[PDB]
Design an enzyme around this catalytic site. Sequence first.
Site, short mmCIF file in Angstrom:
data_model
loop_
_atom_site.label_atom_id
_atom_site.label_comp_id
_atom_site.label_asym_id
_atom_site.label_seq_id
_atom_site.Cartn_x
_atom_site.Cartn_y
_atom_site.Cartn_z
N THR C 1 30.44 15.09 -45.09
CA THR C 1 31.86 14.82 -45.58
C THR C 1 32.86 15.66 -44.79
O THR C 1 32.73 16.83 -44.61
CB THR C 1 32.01 15.10 -47.14
OG1 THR C 1 31.84 13.78 -47.67
CG2 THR C 1 33.35 15.55 -47.73
N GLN C 2 33.92 14.91 -44.33
CA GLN C 2 35.09 15.28 -43.64
C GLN C 2 36.07 14.29 -44.18
O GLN C 2 35.81 13.10 -44.54
CB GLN C 2 35.03 15.11 -42.00
CG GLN C 2 36.26 15.52 -41.27
CD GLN C 2 36.25 17.04 -41.15
OE1 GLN C 2 36.86 17.74 -41.99
NE2 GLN C 2 35.51 17.59 -40.15
N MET C 107 26.31 15.71 -40.29
CA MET C 107 27.17 15.06 -41.25
C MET C 107 28.45 15.67 -41.43
O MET C 107 29.10 15.51 -42.46
CB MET C 107 26.45 14.52 -42.57
CG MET C 107 25.46 13.37 -42.36
SD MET C 107 24.43 12.93 -43.76
CE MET C 107 23.42 14.36 -43.66
#
Lengths: 244, 222, 229, 242, 212, 241, 52, 231, 237
Positions: C1-2, C107
Amino acid sequence: EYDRGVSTFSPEGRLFQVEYSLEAIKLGSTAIGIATKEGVVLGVEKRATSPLLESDSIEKIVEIDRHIGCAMSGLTADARSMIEHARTAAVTHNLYYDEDINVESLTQSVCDLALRFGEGASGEERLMSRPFGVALLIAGHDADDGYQLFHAEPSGTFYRYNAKAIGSGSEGAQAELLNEWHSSLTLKEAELLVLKILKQVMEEKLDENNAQLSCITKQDGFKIYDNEKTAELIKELKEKEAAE
Amino acid sequence: QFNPYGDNGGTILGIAGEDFAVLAGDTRNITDYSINSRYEPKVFDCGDNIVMSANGFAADGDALVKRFKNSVKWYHFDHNDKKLSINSAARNIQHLLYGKRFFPYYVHTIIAGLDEDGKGAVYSFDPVGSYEREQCRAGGAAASLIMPFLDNQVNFKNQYEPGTNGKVKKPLKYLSVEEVIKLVRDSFTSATERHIQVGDGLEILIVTKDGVRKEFYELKRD
Amino acid sequence: TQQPIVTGTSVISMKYDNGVIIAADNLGSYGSLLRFNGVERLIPVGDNTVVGISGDISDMQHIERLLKDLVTENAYDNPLADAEEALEPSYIFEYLATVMYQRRSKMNPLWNAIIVAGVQSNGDQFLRYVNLLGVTYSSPTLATGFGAHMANPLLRKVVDRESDIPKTTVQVAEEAIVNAMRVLYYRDARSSRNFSLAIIDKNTGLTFKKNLQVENMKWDFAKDIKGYG
Amino acid sequence: GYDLSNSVFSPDGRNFQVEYAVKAVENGTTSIGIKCNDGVVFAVEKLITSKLLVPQKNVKIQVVDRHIGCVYSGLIPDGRHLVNRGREEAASFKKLYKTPIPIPAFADRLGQYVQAHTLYNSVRPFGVSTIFGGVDKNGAHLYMLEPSGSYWGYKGAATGKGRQSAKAELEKLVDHHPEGLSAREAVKQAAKIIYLAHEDNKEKDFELEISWCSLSETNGLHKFVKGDLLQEAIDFAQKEIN
Amino acid sequence: TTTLAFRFQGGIIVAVDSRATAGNWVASQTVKKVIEINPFLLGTMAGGAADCQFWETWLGSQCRLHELREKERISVAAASKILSNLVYQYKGAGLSMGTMICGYTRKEGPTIYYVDSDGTRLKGDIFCVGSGQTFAYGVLDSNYKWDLSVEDALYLGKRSILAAAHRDAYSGGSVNLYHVTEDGWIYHGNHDVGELFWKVKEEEGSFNNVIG
Amino acid sequence: GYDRHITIFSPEGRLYQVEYAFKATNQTNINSLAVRGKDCTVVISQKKVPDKLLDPTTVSYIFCISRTIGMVVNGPIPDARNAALRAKAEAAEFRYKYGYDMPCDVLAKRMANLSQIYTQRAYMRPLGVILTFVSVDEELGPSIYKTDPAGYYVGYKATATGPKQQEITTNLENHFKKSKIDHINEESWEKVVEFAITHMIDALGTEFSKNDLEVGVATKDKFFTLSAENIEERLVAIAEQ
Amino acid sequence: TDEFNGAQLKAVTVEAGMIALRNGQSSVKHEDFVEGISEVQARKSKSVSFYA
Amino acid sequence: NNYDGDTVTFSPTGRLFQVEYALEAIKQGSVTVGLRSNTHAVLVALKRNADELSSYQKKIIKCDEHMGLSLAGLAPDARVLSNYLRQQCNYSSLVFNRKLAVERAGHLLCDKAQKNTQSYGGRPYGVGLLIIGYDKSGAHLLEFQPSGNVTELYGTAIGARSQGAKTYLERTLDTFIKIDGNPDELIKAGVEAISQSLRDESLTVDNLSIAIVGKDTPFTIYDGEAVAKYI
Amino acid sequence: YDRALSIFSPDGHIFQVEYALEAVKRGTCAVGVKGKNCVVLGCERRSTLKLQDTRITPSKVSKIDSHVVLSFSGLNADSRILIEKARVEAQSHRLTLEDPVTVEYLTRYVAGVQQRYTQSGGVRPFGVSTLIAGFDPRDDEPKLYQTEPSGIYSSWSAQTIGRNSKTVREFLEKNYDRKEPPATVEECVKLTVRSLLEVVQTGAKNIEITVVKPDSDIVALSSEEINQYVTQIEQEK
C-alpha cells in the site's frame, strides 16, 4: 610454529595443515581404481583385523548415484561428511534440471566442500577448523565424455586419471600402473589387473573378506560385486600367475 | 490503492515439427487500450538453440528472461561446457516459477527448441509451476482463438478419412517448415480481425540445429 | 500500500533522425488543488540524456539523488571513460528499472512513470519506458500521464514506426512537440502554460531550452457557444 | 614484551604495531599536498618500474564525491579500502543532509574509522597516509591523515621516501608567498618539488601526475591535470633543476 | 478430474484421466495425471496442478535419499508421511494437494495412502479423488471384489474413468493405465476417452442414453 | 604472563594495562589550567605548533561537546576525537529522552563508566586521554569535572593537567587559601582569563603568545572560544594590570 | 635477484660455476648464473599437488 | 615467529610475512605469460600433468565470453576468486545493462582480498591471476598479486622463470603493439614468450594452452590440435 | 566461540582423538557376543563399593528403543548426552517415516555426533565408545555394532571395548567361531558370563547380563540368574 593458525603458511609457500592431510591418505588401506573406456572398476582393501570382525557389511565402496561410484581411502570418518554432501549434490541436479550430473561436475562440487577450513577466512560459512583427511577416487559415467575417473584431494583440487591408486600401497601400485595401463584393456582384463596389483600391496592373503570389487557401467549401473563373484576371480588370478 | 500486477497482452504460438520447431508471437505490446509498441519481440533467443517467451504481464515475463539467461551462463561454468538441454531448460524454469508462488508470476511461459533425437520439443508452463509437453500450444490473450484451428490442421482433431464416414480416424501427416508458415500466418490473420490485442507485427522464429531463422511479417493496424 | 500524495503528469517525447525531443509540463498537482508551479521533471543525467519522469514528486526526488550518484560511481576510477563509454541512455534505463521492480516485490512501490531518452555513444537514438509496475518497452514516440493517450496518438501520425525516423527531422519534430504541448493544455486539468523543451541532438549535444510558453491557442470560439436558454 | 598486538600497551606510550605500520608509508611513493588560495593541488610521483607498463593508466588518485581529491601512499590495497570506505561516507552525508560532504566533516569520519582498528586485536591496523582536500562551502582545506588516526590542517604536507626534499621546499614556497599563491601557479611548483624529491629515487625513473580541485580553474570539481598544461609543468621543473 | 487406485490380487491398478481445464476453457487435454515418483512409486495429480506435481518431484529426491542413506527401497508409509508433514508446514499458505501414492513392497505388501493438503494421511484400499470421483466410484465399487484378475481389473479402470468423462465436465482427454506390481508399475499405455466410448457402447451395450 | 598485556588482575591487584594509559597523556606535553570564576569557568591550554607547514588554527584541543559545555583534552588526539564523538552523541541523546541537555556531572560520569567497560574488556583498549569538562550549569554553578582514562572522576575547585601541573597547583592553592573560598571572586569573565594567564606564566616560567594559547570560556548558558586576536587583547591587558 | 645480500649473492656465483663444471665448460656463461638464482630461491619445485 | 603465524599483525619492517609466503606459491607454481596488442589480448599458459596416467591441469578458466583469468598459484583459492568475478559480471548485466569493465573488476577483486588480510584467522590468497578481457577501452591485461594490487601492462608474466619471458616481451614490445587486427601473430609471439620460461620442460600441443579475446572474438580457449596451428 | 579444541597434527592425526581412545581404555569393560537368536551385552559395574544403592544408581546398559540397546565405555558424563540424543532421534523416525529405527541407523547417528565435533573448532570430541546392538522390526537377525569417538563404526560378530579388551578378544578367538555362533540363547549367555569371569570376577555383583531376543523382547537377567550360570562354569572348569 606454522600450524598453530587455522589457515597459515609455511616458509615453503603452501598451506601446512593441508600438507599433513595429503600424508594421512597413506595411513588408510589401499584403494585402487582402474578406468578403461569399457567401464571403470574400483577395488579396495577392506582390512580384516580379527576373525571376530564382520567384514562383509564393511566396505570402502559407496554409491553416490546410479551413474557415479566412489572408493574412499584415508581417514573414513572424514569421508562420512563428504559422501552425504555428494549424494545431495547429485540429487539436486536431477531435482533442478531432471538430468544426470557429469562426473567432473560432481567431483568439483565435493572439492568446493573440502575447502571450508579456517574460522575467519573468506566470505563463506566456515564449519571446519582443519581440512579433511581423506582422498576419493570418484569414478563414473557421463554420456558427454564416456567413462571418467577422477582423484579428488582433501585440498579441493582434482585431476582426471586413467588409473590411480591411493592408500598404503600407493607408490608400489602406481609403479606398475604407469607401464601396465593401456587403452586396449577391456573391463574384464582391467578386473583381473586390479587383483594382481592389489595382491602385491596386500599385507594378508588375497581373499574376498579383505577385498571388495565394484564396477560402474552405463548398462547395469553401479553394481557392487558380491563376495561369491569376487572370490571366483581371485581364484582365477592364482591360476594365471601359475600360467607364467 | 496500488495494484501489484497487470497485463500487457500478446499472443504466442509454439508449434513442434517433426524435425523443426517454431516459437512465434506478435511483436505488439499493449496496456488496456493504448498500443504501447508496434515493434517489440518477447521471443528472445537465449542461447543453445532455445528460444523463450514469457508472455502476458511484461514485468514478470522479463524477470524469467533474466534469471534463465543467468542460468545458461552458470550451467556452462558449473557443469564445464555441458550444454543445456531442452529437457534441462524446462525443469529449470519450473524452479524459477515455483520460487515465487505466494507472490506468483502472471505470465504464460513457453520454451521451444529441438530434442536430442532431432525432432521438435515444446514444453508449456502454467503461471506458478508445472509443465507438460505439447505439439501445438497457443497462449496469450487470444489463445483460445488460434488453438482449436491448430488442432484441426496439425493433429487433425474432429476430422475423419473421406468416404469412411467416421469408421477410420484421420492419422497424422508429416509436416514441412514451409507448411507451418502457412498455418501460422492464416491463424494470426484471423486473429487480427477477431481480437484486438493482435496486430502491427508478427515475428516467427524457426529453430533447428541448423540455425535460428527470424522472419518478420507485418500484420493489420487494427 | 501506497497512496499518491503530490503527483505530476505529462511528458512527451518522439525520435527524429539525429536525436530526440523530450518535453514536459511543469506544475505540481496535488489533486484538484494545485500547490506547486514550475516543478521541473526533466532531470538531465550525463550531458546527452534527459530522464523525463512523471507521477509522485517524492519518489522522483529520492531517485533524483541516486541518478546523480551513478555518475558519481562512473567517475570513480576510469579517467578515460568516466562518461565517454561509461554513460549511455541504456545504462541509465536499466539502473532505474530494477529499483522499481524490487519495490513492486515489496508492495511498497515507487509510484512513477519514467521515460529515459537520449542518444548513445554508439550515436543511435534511445527511447524506453518503465513504471511502478516495472514493465519495459522501446518505442518510436513515447509519453506519460494524460499524454500517453492524447499527445502520443498525434505523434504516431508523425512517426509511425522505427523506419520513419529518418523521414523526420528537428524542425518537423519541433513543431510536432509544440502542437502536442498546446493540445495537452486544453483537455487536461493538470497541464499548465509552462513547459520546458529539451532536444538531445548528436551534433550539438544537450541543448536544454527552459520555460517555453504556449502560443497560438484559440479561445475565440468561446463566445459562439451560447446558453441553453 | 608489549608489541604482540595493538592493545598491549607500554609505560613508554608506544604502540608498536601502529609505529611499524608508518614504515610502509615511509617507503611508499612521494605524494604532496599544496594548500593554495583557490584550492589544493595534489601531485604524486608514480614510479616506472618497467618499459612494459602502460603510462598514465595506473592511478593512485581516486576522487571522492565530485570535489575531494584523495591520494595515498603505503600499501595500495589497504589505502584503496580506506578510500572505498570514504566514498560511502560521502554518499551517506549526501543522502541524509543533502549536500556534498564538507572537507572538515569528511576528515572527522575517516579518523574514527582508523581509530577503530587500533583499539582491537581481532582486526589489523592500517598502514597508509592519505592526503585529501578540496573546495567546499567553508573554503579550501587540506588534511593529511596518519594511520594513527591523527590529522591536522596543513599549509603543505608530504609523505613517502622523498618527503625530506618536498617539505624543505614547501617551507620556501610559503616563504615565497606568505600571503598564499594561486592554484594555477602551484601546478608548476608541484612539478618542481616532485622532481627534487625524485633525487631520493634517482636509481629509478618516474611519471609526473598532477591533479587539482580549485575554484578558479575547475570550479570546485576535482579533475586531473593533463595535456599541454601537464607538459608545461614538466618543462618548468626541468629548467629549474638544470 | 478423477483419479483412482484399487488394490486386488496382482497389486494395484491406477487409472486416471488427462483433461485438465482452466475453467470454462479446457486448457489442455494432454496433461498427465501420473507423476513418476520413481520406478516403484506413482502419484496421481489431483488438486491444484502446480503444487501437486512439484513437491512429488521433490518426493523423488527424498526417495533417492532414502535409497542412498538406508540402502533399502523406501516404504510406502515412509513416502506418504514425508509429503504429509511438509504440506502441514504450508497449511494456510493456500497450496492444494491430493495425491494417491501407490507402492507395493515385500515387507508391507501393496498399500495406497491418500495424502492431502491439510496434513491428513489415510491408509486405504480404494480411493477416488477429484471433481468426478463420485461417478467413477459407482461403477468401480459395485463390481469390486478382492479376488480379481489383471484383465478384469484393467477393463474396470477404463470403464470407471469413462463414466466420469461422460457425465462430468472436467474429465476426459486421455486415460493412462498402470498395473503396479512388486517389480514396479507396468505401463499399459494411453487410450483416448473418445475412441474408448464407442468401443464400450458396442461391447457392453451400455451408454443407452446416447442416441445411436 | 598476560597480567600486564590485558586487563586481568595481577597478584598485586593492580592493573598494569590501565597504568600505561596514564603514562601516555603527559607525553604530548600539553598543560592545562582551569579555574572557576564567580560567573564563569575559564580553561586555557597549550597549543605549541613548531612548524611552518601545520596550520595552527586547526591544531586544537578544545572541542565543544554541548553548546554550554566545553571539553579540553590532554593526551593523544586520535583518542580525543573518539571520546569527543561519544560524548557529543550522549549529550544530544540526553536532550532527546529527558527533555533537557546533559549536565556536566553526568556527562563526566557517563564517559567514566565507558572507560571502566573498556578496561573490563580484554580486547578493547581504553581511550588514553584525560578529559576536563568545563561548564556553567544552573544547578551546580561554575563547575569543573575531570575524568581520567581509568574511569574515575570528581569535581574540582580548580584543576590542572600535564607534566608540569604540580607548579600550577602551587599557584591555585595559594589563591584559594587567601580568598578562603572555592572560586575566584571576579565578576568579569575577561579578567578571569587575565588571571589564568598570569598563573600559567608563574607556574611554568614560560612567556606565552596568542598562538601558544587557546582559551575556552563557559559563561552562563553559552560556551565560546577566544580567537587569537581576542587572546592578544588579554596579553596586552596583562601589561595594563 | 631481489632482496639479496652478499651472502645470498655469493651462493649464486659459485653455483653457476658447478653447472659449468658438470657441463664440462671452460668458461662460465651468462645462463648458468640465471639458473643458479633459482636454486637459492624457494623453488626447485616443478611439483603439482595444489600449488601449481 | 610472532608475525609469520598471525595475519593480524605488523611486523617490525612494516610487512606482513604471510603475504611474502603467499608469493612463494607463485614461484613454485606453473607459469603463464600474457601479452596484448590493443585489439586482442592473449593468455598462454603452460599446463602441467602429475604423471602420464594423469591429465593436464587447465590453467585458464573462462570467466565470461569477454573475460578470462588464469591461475599460477593455489588452486583452491582460484575457485573462490573465479566465482566472485562472475557474480559481479552478472551484477553489471543486471543493474547497468553493461559488461563488467576489466579495470573496475580489478579494484573489486583487490578489496575482497584486503578484508581477509585485515581479519584474524584470515589468509592472503596465494593465487596470482592474469586477467584479460576486451571492454570499451580496448584490450586490457591485468596482473593480480597475492597483495591484491592490480597493474596494467602490454606484456607481463607470473610463475616460475617469469624474467626470461619479460625480456622477450620488452624486445618485441613495439612490434606486437603495432600489429593489430591479426590475432595470429600475437599468439605465435606468446608461444615464443613462454619458450623462455622453460628449463627443459619442452613444449608440446598437450602442454600448450592458449586463450584469446578480441574485439570481434569472444573468450575462447584453444587446446588439443588447435594449439598445433602455432606449433 | 570457534577457537579450535580440535586441530590437525603433523602426524596426520588429531591429538584429542588419540586421547579419547585412551579415555575409553580406562573405562569399564563391555563385552558383546551375539548368538543365532539373541544379542547379549554384559558389562562390568563398579558396584563393589559399599553404602551404595544400585536401584537408583545408573546402569551401564540403557535401552534407546524397544529393540535397540546401547552399552558404553569411557566417561559416564559424556555417555548420557549420546543416550539422550539417540532416543529423541528414534521417536522422530516413528513420527515421520513410521516404524522404529534400525540398529544400523542408530549406529550411524551416534557416529555422526562424534564426527561433527571432530571437524569443527570450539569443541572437543567425546571420550566414549559404544556397543549398539539389537534387532530390526520383523527380523530375527542379531545385530552387533561398535561405534568409536573417531566417527567410524564397524559391525562385528563379537567385540569387546573398555579395559583389557585385548584379553577378552583373545579369549573369544578360541571360544567363538565366525562360522558358528552359540547355537542357543543360554550358551551365548554363559559365554558372556565366562568372558567376564576372566578380568571382572568377584561374584555376580559386578557382572550384568542383558539379553535381547527378536522383535522387542528385552529381559534383564538378575544377579541370581547370573550366580547359577557362574557356579556351573566354575564347577565344569
